[PDB]
């Protein structure tokens, strides 16, 4: 059980690099 | 069970690179 | 069981590169 | 079981490149 | 059981690089 | 510039499945 | 610049699955 | 610059799964 | 600059899983 | 600068799982 809500991110950026993921969520 | 809601992201960006994923969700 | 709702993303971007995915969802 | 609703994405972009996918959904 | 809400991040940035993940959530 | 020579492989097998390749060489 | 030579492999096997490759060589 | 030579491998096996590769060599 | 030579491996085995690789060599 | 030579491994085994690699060599 996991949650995130109403957050904000402001800025130009290098995003994300990930090797291996089980079940996760990614925002870039 | 996972959730995200009402979030905002503002900026031009280098997106995402991912090797291997099971079950996940990705926003770019 | 996974959810995202009412989110917004603003900026020109390099999108996503993914090697291998099982079951997942991708927005670019 | 997966869901996304009421989201918006704003910006010219390079979409997505994916090697192998089982069962998934993609928006480009 | 995990939660985050109403947080804000303001600044152009180096994103994230991650090796291996189980169950997590990532924001870039 | 790449090289392989004088090798041997012995056994019944399921070969190879590849998503996307640029410029490469495959023996099955 | 890469090399392999005079190697041997002995056994029935499940071979290889690869998502994305640039320039590489694969033996199955 | 990389090298392997005169090696031997003996046993029935599950081979390899790889997400993303640049320039590499794979024996299965 | 990398080298391996004259090595031996003896046993039936669960092989390899790799997320992302730059320049490497894999024996399974 | 790296080297291995004349080594031996004897036993049925769980192989290797790796997230992200630069330049390495892997035996399974």
Swiss-Prot record, chains A, B, C, D, E, F, G, H, I, J:
Result after altering residue 21 to L: Reduced lipid peroxidation inhibition
Site (Implicated in free radical propagation) residue list: 19
Glycan attachment sites: 2
Superkingdom of the organism of origin: Eukaryota
Effect listed in the UniProt record for changing residue 19 to V: Reduced protein oxidation. No hippocampal neuron toxicity
Result when mutating residue 20 to V: In CAA-APP; Italian type
Protein's cellular compartments: Cell surface
Consequence recorded when altering residue 5 to R: Only 23% zinc-induced amyloid-beta protein 28 aggregation
Effect of residue 21 to V: No free radical production. No hippocampal neuron toxicity
Protein residues bound to Cu(2+) 2: 2, 5-6
Chain positions of site Susceptible to oxidation: 21
Residue numbers binding Zn(2+) 2: 2, 5-6
Annotated region described as Interaction with PSEN1, given as residue ranges: 10-28
Site feature location: Cleavage: 8-9, 26-27
Its job: More effective reductant than amyloid-beta protein 40. May activate mononuclear phagocytes in the brain and elicit inflammatory responses.
Subunit structure: Interacts with FPR2.
Protein name (Swiss-Prot/TrEMBL): Amyloid-beta protein 42
Annotated source species: Homo sapiens
């Amino acid at each position: 059980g996991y949650e995130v809500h109403h957050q904000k991110l402001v800025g130009s950026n290098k995003g994300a690099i990930i090797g291996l993921m089980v079940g996760g969520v990614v925002i870039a």
